[PDB]
C-alpha cells in the first residue's frame, strides 16, 4: 500500500499491477473480510493488520 | 432524528454532534446490523426501531 510512484506517506492509494504494467486504485474500497463483516485498523507496506471476528 | 433546527418529518437529514456545534449528514448511511444484517422499520427523535436476525 501507499505508493505513488515513489515514497509517499498517504492512506488514500492503493497500488496494484494488471499484466506487466502498474496501474492505481484506490484504498477507502479495499475490504478484507472473514464469513462475518469486518473492519481494518491501519495497515502500511505488504501487510495488512486488523482484528477480525 | 429528523431535526434540521426545528421540527420536520423526512426521511434524509440527519444531525451528528461534533465538540459544542451542529453538523449535517444523511440518513442513507444509517445502518444497524449485528453478526447478520438487520432491517429497519422506521423511526423518531431519539430512538430507533428494528426487527432483526
Chains 1, 2 share one sequence.
Not at 501507499?2 to 484506490?26: P, V
Not at 477507502?28 to 495497515?43: E, F, M, N, P
Amino acid at each position: 500500500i501507499g505508493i505513488n510512484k515513489g515514497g509517499t506517506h498517504e492512506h488514500n492509494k492503493i497500488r496494484y499491477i494488471a499484466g506487466h504494467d502498474m496501474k492505481e486504485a484506490n484504498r477507502d474500497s479495499l475490504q478484507v473480510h472473514t464469513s462475518g463483516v469486518c473492519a481494518i485498523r491501519g495497515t502500511m507496506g505488504h501487510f495488512i493488520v486488523a482484528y477480525c471476528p
